[PDB]
Short mmCIF file of the N, C-alpha and C atoms (twelve columns), coordinates in Angstrom:
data_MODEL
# 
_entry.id   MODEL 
# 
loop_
_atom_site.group_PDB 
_atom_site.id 
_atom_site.type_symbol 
_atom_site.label_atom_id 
_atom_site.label_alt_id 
_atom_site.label_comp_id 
_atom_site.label_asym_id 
_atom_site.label_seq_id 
_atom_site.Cartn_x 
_atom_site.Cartn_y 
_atom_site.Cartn_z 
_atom_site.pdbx_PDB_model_num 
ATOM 1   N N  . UNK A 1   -17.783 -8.069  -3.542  1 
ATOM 2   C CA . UNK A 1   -18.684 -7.180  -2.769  1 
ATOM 3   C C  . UNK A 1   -18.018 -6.786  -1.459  1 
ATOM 4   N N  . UNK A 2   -17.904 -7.981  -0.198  1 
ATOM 5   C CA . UNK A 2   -17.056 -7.440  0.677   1 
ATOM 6   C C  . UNK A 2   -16.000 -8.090  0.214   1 
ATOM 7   N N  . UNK A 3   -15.761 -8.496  -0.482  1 
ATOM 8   C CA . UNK A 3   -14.681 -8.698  -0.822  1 
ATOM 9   C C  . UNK A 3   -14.018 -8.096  -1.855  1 
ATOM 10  N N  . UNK A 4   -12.671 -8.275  -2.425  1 
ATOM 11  C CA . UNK A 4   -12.176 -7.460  -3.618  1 
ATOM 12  C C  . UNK A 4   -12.133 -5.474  -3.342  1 
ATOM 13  N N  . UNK A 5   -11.315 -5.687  -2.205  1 
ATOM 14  C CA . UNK A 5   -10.788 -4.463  -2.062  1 
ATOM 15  C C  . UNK A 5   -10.589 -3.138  -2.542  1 
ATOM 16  N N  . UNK A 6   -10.020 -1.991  -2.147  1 
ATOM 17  C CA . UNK A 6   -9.781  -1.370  -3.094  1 
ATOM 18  C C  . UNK A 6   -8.311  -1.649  -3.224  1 
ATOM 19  N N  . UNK A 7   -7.657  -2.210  -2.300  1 
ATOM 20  C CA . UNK A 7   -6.163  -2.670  -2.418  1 
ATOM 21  C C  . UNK A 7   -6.276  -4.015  -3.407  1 
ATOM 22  N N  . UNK A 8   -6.910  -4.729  -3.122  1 
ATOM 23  C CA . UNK A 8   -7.199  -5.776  -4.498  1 
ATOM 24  C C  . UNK A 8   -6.864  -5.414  -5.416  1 
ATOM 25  N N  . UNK A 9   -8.442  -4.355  -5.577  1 
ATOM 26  C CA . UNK A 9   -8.785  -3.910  -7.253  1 
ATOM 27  C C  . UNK A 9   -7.520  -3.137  -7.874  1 
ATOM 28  N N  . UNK A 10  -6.288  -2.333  -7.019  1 
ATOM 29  C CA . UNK A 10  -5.491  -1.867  -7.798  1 
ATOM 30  C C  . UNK A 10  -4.426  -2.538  -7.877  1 
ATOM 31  N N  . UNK A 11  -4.516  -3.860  -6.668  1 
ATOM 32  C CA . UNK A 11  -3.121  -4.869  -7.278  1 
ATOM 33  C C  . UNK A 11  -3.835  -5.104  -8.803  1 
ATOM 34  N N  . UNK A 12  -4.826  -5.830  -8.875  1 
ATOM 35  C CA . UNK A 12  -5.306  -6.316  -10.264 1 
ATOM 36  C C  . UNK A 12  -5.058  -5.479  -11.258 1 
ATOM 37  N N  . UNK A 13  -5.354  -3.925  -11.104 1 
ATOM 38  C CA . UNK A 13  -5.079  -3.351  -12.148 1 
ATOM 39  C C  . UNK A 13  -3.453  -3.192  -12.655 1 
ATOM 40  N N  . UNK A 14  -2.823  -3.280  -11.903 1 
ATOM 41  C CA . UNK A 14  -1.219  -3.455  -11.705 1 
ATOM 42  C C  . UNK A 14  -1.114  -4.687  -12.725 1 
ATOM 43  N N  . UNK A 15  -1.545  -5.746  -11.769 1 
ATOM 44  C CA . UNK A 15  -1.027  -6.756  -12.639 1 
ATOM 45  C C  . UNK A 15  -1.548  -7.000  -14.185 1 
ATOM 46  N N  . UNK A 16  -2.923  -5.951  -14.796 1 
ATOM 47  C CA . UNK A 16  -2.921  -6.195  -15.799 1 
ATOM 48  C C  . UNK A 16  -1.930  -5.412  -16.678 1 
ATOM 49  N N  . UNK A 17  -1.596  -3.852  -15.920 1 
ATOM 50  C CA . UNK A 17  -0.436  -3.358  -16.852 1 
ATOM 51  C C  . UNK A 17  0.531   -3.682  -16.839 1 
ATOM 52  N N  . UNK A 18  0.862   -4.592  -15.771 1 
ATOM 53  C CA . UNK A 18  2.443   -5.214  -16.200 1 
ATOM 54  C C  . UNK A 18  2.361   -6.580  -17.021 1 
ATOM 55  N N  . UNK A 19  1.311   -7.189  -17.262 1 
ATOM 56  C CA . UNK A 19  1.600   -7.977  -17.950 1 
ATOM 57  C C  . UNK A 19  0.964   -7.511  -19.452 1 
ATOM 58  N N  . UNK A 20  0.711   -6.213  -19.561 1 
ATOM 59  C CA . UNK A 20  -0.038  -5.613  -20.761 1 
ATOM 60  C C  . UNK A 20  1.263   -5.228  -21.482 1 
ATOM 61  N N  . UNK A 21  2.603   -4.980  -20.453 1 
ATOM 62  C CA . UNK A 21  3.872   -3.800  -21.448 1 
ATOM 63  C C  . UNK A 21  4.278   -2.899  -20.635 1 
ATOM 64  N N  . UNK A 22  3.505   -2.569  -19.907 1 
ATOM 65  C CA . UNK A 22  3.990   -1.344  -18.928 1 
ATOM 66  C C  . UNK A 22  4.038   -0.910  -18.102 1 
ATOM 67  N N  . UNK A 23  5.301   -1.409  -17.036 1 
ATOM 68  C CA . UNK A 23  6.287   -1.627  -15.545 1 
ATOM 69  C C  . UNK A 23  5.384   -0.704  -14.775 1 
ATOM 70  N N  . UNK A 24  5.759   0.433   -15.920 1 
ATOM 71  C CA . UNK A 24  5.473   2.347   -15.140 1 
ATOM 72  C C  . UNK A 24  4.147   2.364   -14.778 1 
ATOM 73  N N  . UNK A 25  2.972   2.140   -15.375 1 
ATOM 74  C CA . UNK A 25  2.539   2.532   -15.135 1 
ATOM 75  C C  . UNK A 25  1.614   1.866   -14.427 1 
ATOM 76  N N  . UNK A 26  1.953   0.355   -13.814 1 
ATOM 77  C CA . UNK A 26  1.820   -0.527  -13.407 1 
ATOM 78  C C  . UNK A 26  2.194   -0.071  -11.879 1 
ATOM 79  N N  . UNK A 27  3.338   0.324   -11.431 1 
ATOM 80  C CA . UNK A 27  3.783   1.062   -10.215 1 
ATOM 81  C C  . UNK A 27  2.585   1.913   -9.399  1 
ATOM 82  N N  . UNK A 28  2.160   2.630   -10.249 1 
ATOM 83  C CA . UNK A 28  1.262   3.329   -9.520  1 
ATOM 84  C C  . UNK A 28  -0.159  2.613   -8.680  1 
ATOM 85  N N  . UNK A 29  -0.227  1.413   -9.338  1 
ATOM 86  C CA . UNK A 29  -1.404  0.837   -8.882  1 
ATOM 87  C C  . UNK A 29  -0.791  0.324   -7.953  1 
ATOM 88  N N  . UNK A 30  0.183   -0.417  -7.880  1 
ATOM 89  C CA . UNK A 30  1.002   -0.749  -6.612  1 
ATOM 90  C C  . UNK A 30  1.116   -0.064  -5.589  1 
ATOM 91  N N  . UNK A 31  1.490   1.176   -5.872  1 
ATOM 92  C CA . UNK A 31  1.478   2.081   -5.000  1 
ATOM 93  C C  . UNK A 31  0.163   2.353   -3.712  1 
ATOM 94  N N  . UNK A 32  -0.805  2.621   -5.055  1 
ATOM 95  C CA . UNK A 32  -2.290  2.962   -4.321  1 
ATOM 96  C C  . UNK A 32  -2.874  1.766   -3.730  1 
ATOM 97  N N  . UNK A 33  -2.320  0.421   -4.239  1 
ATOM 98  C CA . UNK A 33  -2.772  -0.863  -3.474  1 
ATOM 99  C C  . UNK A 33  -2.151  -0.788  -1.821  1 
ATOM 100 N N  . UNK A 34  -1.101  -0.331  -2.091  1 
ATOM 101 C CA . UNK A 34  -0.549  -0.541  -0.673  1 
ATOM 102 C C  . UNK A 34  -0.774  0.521   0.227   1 
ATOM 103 N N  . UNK A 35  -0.955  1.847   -0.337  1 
ATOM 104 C CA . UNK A 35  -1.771  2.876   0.002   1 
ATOM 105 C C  . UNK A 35  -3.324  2.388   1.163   1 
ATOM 106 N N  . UNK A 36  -4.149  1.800   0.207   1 
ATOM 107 C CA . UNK A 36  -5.214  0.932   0.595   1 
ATOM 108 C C  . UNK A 36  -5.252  -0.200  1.928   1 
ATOM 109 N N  . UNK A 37  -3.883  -0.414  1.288   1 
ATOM 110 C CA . UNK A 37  -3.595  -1.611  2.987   1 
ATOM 111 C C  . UNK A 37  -3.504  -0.808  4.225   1 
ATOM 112 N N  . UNK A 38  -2.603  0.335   4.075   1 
ATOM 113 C CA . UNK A 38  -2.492  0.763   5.152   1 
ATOM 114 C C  . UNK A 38  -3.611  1.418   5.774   1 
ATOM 115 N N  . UNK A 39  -4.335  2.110   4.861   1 
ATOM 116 C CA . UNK A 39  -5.450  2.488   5.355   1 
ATOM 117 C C  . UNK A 39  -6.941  1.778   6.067   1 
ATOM 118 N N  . UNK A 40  -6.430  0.797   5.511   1 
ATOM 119 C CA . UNK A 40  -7.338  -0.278  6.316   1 
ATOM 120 C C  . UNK A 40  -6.336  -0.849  7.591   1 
ATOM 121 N N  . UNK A 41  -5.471  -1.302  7.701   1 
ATOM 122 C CA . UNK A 41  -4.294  -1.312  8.632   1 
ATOM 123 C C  . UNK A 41  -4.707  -0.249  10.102  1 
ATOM 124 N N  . UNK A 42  -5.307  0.923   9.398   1 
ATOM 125 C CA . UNK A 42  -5.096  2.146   10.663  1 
ATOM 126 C C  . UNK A 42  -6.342  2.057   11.425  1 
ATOM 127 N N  . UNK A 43  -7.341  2.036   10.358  1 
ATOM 128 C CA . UNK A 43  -8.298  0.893   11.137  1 
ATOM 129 C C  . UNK A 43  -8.543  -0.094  12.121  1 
ATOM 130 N N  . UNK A 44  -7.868  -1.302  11.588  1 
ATOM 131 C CA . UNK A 44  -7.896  -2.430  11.826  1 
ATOM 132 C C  . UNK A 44  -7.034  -2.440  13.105  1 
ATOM 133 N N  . UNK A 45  -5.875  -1.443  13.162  1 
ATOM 134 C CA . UNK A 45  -5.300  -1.429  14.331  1 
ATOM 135 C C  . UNK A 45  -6.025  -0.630  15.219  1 
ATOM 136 N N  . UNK A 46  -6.262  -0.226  14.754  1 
ATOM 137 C CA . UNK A 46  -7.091  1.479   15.567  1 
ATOM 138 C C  . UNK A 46  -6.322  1.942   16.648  1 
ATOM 139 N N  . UNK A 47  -5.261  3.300   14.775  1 
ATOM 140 C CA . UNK A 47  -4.664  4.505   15.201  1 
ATOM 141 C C  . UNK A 47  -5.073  5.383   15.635  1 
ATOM 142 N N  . UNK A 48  -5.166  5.492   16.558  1 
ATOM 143 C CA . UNK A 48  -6.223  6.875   17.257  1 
ATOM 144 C C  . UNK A 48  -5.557  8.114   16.703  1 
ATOM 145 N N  . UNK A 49  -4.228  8.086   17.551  1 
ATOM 146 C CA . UNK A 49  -3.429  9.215   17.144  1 
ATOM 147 C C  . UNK A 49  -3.130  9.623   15.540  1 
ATOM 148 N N  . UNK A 50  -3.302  9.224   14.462  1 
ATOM 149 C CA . UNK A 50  -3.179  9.049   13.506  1 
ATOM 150 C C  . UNK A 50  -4.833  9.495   12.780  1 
ATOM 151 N N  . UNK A 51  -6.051  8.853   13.168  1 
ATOM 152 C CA . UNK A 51  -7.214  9.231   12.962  1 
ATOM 153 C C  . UNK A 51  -7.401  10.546  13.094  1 
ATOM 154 N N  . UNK A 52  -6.607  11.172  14.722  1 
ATOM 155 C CA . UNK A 52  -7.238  12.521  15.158  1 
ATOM 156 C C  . UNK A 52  -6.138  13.674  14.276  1 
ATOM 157 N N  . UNK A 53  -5.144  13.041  13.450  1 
ATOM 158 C CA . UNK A 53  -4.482  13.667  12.733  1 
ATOM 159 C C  . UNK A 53  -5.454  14.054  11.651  1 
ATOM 160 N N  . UNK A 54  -5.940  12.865  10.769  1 
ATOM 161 C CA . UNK A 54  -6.602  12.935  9.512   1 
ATOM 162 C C  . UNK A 54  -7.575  13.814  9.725   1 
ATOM 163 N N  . UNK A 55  -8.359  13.737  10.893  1 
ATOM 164 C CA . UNK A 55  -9.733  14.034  11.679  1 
ATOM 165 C C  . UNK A 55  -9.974  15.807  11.033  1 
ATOM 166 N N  . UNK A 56  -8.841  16.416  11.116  1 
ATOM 167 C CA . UNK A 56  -8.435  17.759  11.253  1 
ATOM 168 C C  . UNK A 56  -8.800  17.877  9.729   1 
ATOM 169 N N  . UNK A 57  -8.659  16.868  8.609   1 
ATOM 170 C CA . UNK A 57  -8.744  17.746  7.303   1 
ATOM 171 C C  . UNK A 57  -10.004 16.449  6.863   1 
ATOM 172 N N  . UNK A 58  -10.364 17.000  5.627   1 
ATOM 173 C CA . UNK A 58  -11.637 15.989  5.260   1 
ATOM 174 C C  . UNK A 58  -11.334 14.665  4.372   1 
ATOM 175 N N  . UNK A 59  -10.103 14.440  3.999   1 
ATOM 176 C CA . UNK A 59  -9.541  13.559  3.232   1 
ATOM 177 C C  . UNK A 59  -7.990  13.001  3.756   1 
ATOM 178 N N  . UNK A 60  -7.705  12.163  2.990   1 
ATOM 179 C CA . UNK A 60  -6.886  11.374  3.868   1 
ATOM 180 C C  . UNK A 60  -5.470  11.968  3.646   1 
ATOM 181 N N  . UNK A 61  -4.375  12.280  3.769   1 
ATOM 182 C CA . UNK A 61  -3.119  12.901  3.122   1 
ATOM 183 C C  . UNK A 61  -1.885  11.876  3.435   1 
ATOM 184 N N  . UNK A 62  -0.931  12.567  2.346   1 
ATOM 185 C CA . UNK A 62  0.416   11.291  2.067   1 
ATOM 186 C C  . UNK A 62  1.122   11.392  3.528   1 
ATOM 187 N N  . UNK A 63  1.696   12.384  3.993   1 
ATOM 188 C CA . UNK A 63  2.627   12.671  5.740   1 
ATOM 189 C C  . UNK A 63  1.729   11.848  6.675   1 
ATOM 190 N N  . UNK A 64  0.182   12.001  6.476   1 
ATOM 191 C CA . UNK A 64  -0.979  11.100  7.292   1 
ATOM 192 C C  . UNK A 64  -0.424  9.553   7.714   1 
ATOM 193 N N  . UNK A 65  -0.485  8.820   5.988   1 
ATOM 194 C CA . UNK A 65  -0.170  7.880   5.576   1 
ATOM 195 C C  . UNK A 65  1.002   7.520   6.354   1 
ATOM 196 N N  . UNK A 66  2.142   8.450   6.257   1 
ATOM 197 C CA . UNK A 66  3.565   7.905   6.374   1 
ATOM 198 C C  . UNK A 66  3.821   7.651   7.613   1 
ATOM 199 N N  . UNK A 67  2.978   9.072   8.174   1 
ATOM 200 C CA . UNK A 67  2.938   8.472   10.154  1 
ATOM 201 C C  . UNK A 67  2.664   7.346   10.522  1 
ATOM 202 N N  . UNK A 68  1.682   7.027   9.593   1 
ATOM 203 C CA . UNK A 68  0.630   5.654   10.071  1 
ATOM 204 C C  . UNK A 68  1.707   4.319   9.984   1 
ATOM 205 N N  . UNK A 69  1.999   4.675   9.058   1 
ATOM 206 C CA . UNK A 69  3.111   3.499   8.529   1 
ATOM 207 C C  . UNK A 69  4.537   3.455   9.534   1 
ATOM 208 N N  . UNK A 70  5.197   4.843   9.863   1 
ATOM 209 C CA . UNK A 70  6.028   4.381   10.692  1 
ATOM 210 C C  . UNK A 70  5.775   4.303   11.901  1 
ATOM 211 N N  . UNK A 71  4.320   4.340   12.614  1 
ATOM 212 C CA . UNK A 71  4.520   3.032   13.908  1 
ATOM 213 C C  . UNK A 71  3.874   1.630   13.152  1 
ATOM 214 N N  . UNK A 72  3.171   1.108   14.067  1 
ATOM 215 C CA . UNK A 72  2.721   0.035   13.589  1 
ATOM 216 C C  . UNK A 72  4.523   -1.276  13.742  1 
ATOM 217 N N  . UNK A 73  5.590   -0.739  14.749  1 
ATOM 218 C CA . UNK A 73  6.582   -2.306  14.412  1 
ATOM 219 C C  . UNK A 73  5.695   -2.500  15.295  1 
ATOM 220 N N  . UNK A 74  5.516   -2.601  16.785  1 
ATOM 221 C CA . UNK A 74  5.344   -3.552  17.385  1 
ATOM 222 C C  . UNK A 74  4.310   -4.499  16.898  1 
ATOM 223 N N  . UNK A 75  3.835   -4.741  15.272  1 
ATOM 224 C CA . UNK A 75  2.961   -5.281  14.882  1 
ATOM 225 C C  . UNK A 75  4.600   -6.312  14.274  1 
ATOM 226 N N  . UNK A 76  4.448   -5.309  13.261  1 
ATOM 227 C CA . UNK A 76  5.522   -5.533  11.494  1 
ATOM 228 C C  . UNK A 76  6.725   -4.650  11.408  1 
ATOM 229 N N  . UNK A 77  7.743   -4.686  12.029  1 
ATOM 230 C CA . UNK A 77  9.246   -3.860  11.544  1 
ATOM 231 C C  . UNK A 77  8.959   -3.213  10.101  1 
ATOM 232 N N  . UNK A 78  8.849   -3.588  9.267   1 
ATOM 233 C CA . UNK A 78  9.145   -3.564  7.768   1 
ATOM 234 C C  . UNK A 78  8.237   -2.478  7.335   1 
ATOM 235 N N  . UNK A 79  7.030   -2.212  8.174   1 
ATOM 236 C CA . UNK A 79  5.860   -1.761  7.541   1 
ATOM 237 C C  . UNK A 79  6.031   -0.149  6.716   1 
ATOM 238 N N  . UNK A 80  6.657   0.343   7.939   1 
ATOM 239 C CA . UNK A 80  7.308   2.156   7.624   1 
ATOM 240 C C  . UNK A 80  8.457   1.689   6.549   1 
ATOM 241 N N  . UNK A 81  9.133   0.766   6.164   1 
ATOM 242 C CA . UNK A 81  10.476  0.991   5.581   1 
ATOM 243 C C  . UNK A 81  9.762   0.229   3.553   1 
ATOM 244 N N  . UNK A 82  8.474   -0.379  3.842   1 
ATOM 245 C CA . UNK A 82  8.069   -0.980  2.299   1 
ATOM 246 C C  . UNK A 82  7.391   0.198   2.646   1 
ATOM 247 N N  . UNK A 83  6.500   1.181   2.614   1 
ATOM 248 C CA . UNK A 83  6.084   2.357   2.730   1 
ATOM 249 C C  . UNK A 83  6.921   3.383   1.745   1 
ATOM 250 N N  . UNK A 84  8.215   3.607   2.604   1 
ATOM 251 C CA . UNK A 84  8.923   4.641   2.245   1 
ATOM 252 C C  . UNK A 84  9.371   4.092   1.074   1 
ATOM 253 N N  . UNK A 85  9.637   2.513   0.444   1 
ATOM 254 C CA . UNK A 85  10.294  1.824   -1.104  1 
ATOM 255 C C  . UNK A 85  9.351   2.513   -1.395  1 
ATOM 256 N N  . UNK A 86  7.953   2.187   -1.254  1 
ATOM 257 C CA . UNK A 86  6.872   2.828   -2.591  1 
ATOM 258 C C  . UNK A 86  7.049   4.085   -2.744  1 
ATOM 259 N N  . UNK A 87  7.213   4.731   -1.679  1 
ATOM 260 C CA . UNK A 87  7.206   6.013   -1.964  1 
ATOM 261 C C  . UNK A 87  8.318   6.763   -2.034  1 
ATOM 262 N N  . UNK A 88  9.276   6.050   -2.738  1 
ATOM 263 C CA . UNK A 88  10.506  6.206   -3.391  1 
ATOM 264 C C  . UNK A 88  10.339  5.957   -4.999  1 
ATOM 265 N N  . UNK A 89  9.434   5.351   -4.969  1 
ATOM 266 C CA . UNK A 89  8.970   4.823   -6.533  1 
ATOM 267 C C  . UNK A 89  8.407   6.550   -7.226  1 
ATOM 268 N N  . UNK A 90  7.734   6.520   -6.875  1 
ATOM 269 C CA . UNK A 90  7.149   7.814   -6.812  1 
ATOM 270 C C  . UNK A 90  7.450   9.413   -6.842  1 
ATOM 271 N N  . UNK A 91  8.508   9.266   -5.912  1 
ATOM 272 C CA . UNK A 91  8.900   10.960  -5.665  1 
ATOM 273 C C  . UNK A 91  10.832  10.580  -6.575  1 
ATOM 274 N N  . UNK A 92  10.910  9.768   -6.677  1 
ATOM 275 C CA . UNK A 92  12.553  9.440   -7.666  1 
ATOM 276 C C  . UNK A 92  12.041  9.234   -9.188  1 
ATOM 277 N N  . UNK A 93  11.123  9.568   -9.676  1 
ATOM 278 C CA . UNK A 93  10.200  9.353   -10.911 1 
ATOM 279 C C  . UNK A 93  11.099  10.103  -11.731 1 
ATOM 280 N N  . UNK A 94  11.813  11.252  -11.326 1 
ATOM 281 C CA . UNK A 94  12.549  12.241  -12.053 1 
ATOM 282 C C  . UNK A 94  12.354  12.466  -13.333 1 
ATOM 283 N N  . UNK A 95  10.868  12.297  -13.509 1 
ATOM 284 C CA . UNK A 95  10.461  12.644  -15.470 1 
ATOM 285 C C  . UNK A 95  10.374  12.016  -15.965 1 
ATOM 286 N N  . UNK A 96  11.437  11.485  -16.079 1 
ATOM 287 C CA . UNK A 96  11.698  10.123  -16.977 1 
ATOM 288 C C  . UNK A 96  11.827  8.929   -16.170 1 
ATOM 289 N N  . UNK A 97  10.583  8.786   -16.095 1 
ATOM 290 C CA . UNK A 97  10.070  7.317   -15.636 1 
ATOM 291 C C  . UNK A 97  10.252  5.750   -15.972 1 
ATOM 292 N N  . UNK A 98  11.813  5.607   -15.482 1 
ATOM 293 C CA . UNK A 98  12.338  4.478   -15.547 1 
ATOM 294 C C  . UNK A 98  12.401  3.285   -14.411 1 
ATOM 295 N N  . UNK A 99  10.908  3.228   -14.035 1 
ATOM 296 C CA . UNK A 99  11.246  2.235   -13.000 1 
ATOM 297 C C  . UNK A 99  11.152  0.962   -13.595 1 
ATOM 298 N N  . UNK A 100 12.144  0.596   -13.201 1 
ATOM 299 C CA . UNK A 100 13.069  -1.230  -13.899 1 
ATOM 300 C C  . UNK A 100 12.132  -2.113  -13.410 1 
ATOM 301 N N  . UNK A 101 11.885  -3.275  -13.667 1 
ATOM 302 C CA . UNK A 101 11.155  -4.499  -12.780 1 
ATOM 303 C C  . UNK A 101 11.982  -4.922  -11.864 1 
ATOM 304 N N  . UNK A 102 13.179  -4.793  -11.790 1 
ATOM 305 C CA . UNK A 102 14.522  -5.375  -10.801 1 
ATOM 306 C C  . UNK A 102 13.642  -4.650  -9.644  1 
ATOM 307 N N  . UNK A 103 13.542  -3.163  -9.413  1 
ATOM 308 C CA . UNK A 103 12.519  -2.774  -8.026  1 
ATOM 309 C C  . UNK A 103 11.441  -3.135  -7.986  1 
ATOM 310 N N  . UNK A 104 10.503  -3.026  -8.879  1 
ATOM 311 C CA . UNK A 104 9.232   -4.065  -9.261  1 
ATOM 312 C C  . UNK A 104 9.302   -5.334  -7.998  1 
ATOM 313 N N  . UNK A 105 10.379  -6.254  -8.565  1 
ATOM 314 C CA . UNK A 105 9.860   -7.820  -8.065  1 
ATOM 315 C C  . UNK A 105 10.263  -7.635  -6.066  1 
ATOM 316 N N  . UNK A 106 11.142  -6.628  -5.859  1 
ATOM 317 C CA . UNK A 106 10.875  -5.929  -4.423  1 
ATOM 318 C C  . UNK A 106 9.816   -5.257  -3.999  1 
ATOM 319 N N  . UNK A 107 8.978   -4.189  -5.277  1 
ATOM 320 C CA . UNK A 107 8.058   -3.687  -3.864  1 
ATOM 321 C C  . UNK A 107 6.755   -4.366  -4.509  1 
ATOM 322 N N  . UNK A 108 6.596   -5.699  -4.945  1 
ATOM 323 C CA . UNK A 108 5.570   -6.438  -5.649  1 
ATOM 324 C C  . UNK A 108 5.594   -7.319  -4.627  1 
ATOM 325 N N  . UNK A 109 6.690   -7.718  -3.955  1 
ATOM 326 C CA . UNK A 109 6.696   -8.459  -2.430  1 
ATOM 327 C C  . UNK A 109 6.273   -8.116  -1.324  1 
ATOM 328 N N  . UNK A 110 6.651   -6.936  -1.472  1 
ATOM 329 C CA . UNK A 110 6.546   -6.268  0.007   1 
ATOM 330 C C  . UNK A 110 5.209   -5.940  0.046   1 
ATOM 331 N N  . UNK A 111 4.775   -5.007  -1.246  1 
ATOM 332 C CA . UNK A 111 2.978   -4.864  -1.476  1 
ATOM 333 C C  . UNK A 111 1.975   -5.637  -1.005  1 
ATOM 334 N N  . UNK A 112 2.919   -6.893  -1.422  1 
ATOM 335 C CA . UNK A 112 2.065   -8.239  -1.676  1 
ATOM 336 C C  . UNK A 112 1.845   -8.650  0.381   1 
ATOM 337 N N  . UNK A 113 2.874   -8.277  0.716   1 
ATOM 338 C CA . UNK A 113 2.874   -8.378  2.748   1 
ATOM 339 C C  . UNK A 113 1.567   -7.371  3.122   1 
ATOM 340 N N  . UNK A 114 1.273   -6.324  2.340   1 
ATOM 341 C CA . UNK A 114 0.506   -5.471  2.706   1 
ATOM 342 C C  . UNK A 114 -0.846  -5.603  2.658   1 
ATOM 343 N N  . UNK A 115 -1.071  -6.305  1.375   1 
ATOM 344 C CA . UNK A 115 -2.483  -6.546  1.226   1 
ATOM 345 C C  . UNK A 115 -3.187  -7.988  1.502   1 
ATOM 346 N N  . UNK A 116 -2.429  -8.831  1.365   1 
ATOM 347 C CA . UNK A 116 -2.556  -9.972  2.090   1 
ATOM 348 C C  . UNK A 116 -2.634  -10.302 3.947   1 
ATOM 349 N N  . UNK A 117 -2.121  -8.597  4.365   1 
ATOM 350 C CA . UNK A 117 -2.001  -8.858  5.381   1 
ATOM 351 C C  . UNK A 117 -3.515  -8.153  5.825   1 
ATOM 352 N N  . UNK A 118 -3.783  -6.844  5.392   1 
ATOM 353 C CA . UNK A 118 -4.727  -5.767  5.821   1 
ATOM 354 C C  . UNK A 118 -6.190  -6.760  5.077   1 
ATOM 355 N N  . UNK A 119 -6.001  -7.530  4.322   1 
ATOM 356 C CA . UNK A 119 -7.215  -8.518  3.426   1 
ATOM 357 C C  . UNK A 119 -7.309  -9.701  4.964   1 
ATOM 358 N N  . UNK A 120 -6.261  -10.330 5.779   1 
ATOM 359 C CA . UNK A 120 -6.300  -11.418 6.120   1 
ATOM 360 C C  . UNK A 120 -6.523  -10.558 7.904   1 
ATOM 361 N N  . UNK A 121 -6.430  -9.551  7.765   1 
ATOM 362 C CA . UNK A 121 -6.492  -8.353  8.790   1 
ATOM 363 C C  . UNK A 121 -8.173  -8.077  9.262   1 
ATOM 364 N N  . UNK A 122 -8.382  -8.105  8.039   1 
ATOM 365 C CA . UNK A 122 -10.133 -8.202  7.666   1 
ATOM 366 C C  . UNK A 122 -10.801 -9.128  7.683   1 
ATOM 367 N N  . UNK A 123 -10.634 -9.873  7.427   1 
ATOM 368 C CA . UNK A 123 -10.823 -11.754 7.253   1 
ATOM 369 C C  . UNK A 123 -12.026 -11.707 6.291   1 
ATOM 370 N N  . UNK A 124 -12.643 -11.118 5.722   1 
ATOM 371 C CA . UNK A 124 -13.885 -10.674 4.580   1 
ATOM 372 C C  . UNK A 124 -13.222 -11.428 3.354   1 
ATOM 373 N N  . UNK A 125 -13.770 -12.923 3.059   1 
ATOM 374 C CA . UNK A 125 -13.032 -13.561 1.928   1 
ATOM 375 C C  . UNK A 125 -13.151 -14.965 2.103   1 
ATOM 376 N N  . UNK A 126 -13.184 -15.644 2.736   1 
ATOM 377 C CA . UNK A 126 -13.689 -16.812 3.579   1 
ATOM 378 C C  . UNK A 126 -13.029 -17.090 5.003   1 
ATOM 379 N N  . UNK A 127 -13.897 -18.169 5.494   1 
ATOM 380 C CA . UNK A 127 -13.284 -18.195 7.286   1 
ATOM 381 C C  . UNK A 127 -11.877 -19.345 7.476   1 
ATOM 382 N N  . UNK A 128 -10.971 -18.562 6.962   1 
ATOM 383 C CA . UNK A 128 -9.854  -19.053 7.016   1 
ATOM 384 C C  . UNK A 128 -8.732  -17.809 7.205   1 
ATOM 385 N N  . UNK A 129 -7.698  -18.088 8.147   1 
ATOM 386 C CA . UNK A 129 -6.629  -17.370 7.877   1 
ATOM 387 C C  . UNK A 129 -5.320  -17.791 7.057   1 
# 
């Protein structure tokens, strides 16, 4: 309820297609999981400058996202650079959608920094950090 995210719900769905057969299409939930972190992230930090960006259109957009992601070091260094892996997953798709698990078990880590962090960011889950 408050718990189980929408960054959760699409790690979970991730992890059921990768352990169903299929890497590919498993990526994408990854993607939108970490998508999810950040967006709670912009929140949780409260990006102003970044809000009054979104503010301008009625939905949230990917350049939105990417801004958001490359500030945020003086939190997390890494945050803009596992950002741009996912979204290398994505725009290097070149048709033929061969993403290997060798990048998998990298941005399944880094994901994993994202939502554990924007979940523990939230603290909605029990009173523990």
């Amino acid at each position: 309820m408050s718990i189980s995210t929408s960054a959760e719900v699409y790690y979970e769905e991730a992890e059921e297609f990768l352990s169903k057969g299929d890497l590919v299409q498993a990526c994408e939930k990854y993607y939108k999981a970490a998508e999810e972190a950040i967006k709670l992230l912009v929140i949780e930090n409260n990006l102003k400058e970044i809000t009054n960006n979104v503010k301008n259109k009625g939905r949230w957009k990917s350049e939105n996202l990417f801004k958001a992601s490359k500030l945020l070091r003086s939190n997390n260094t890494e945050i803009p650079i596992l950002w741009k892996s996912a979204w290398t997953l994505h725009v290097e798709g070149f048709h033929e959608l061969s993403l290997n698990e060798k990048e998998v078990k990298k941005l399944k880590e880094d994901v994993r920094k994202l939502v554990i962090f924007a979940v523990n960011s939230l603290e909605h889950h029990h009173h523990h950090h």
